[PDB]
Amino acid sequence: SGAIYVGNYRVVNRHLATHNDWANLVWEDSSRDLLVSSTTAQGCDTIARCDCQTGVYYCSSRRKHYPVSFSKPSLIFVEASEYYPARYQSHLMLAVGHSEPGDCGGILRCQHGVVGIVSTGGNGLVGFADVRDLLWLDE
Numbered sequence: 513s514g515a516i517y518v519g520n521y522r523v524v525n526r527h528l529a530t531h532n533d534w535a536n537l538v539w540e541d542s543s544r545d546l547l548v549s550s551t552t553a554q555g556c557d558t559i560a561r562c563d564c565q566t567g568v569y570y571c572s573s574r575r576k577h578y579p580v581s582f583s584k585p586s587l588i589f590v591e592a593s594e595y596y597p598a599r600y601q602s603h604l605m606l607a608v609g610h611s612e613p614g615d616c617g618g619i620l621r622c623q624h625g626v627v628g629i630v631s632t633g634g635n636g637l638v639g640f641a642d643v644r645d646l647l648w649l650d651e
């Protein structure tokens with residue numbers, strides 16, 4: 513589990529979205545596994561606007577933050593799950609690091625702010641759905 517709270521927005525994994533996220537849907541993209549919904553309370557998370565390839569992520573399954581090097585946002589093929597058939601997921605960044613199903617939602621951060629959230633994993637690799645290109649989250 514895990515979300516990003518910026519302004520009047522809540523960003524979550526699309527596969528983890530609630531009935532309330534869908535009833536107040538702003539934008540959603542299956543190819544990215546992202547869903548943004550509106551909120552009444554104001555969010556204080558800062559989104560990074562950068563091209564960093566190093567950061568720190570929160571790993572729920574170990575209650576630890578881990579430093580990682582991560583690839584640039586791209587189309588990476590993701591194995592079939594109870595949420596999606598086997599497809600290419602776009603805007604995905606990979607890193608060598610631990611992840612278990614249940615770790616989706618954990619935030620990835622650099623010195624500039626919030627980079628993205630855990631979205632894929634397995635084989636000792638972890639995937640992060642990037643949010644830095646979503647310039648509208650700040651307006």
Ligand SMILES: Cc1ncnc(C)c1CC(=O)N1CCC[C@H](C(N)=O)C1
Nearest residue numbers: 545593595611612613631632633634
């Ligand atoms: C299998 C597995 N191992 C280790 N870590 C994780 C997070 C996972 C879970 C994972 O990769 N999923 C399941 C939920 C939907 C995801 C998606 N973006 O399509 C894919």
Ligand SMILES: [Zn+2]
Nearest residue numbers: 562564622624
């Ligand atoms: Zn950065």
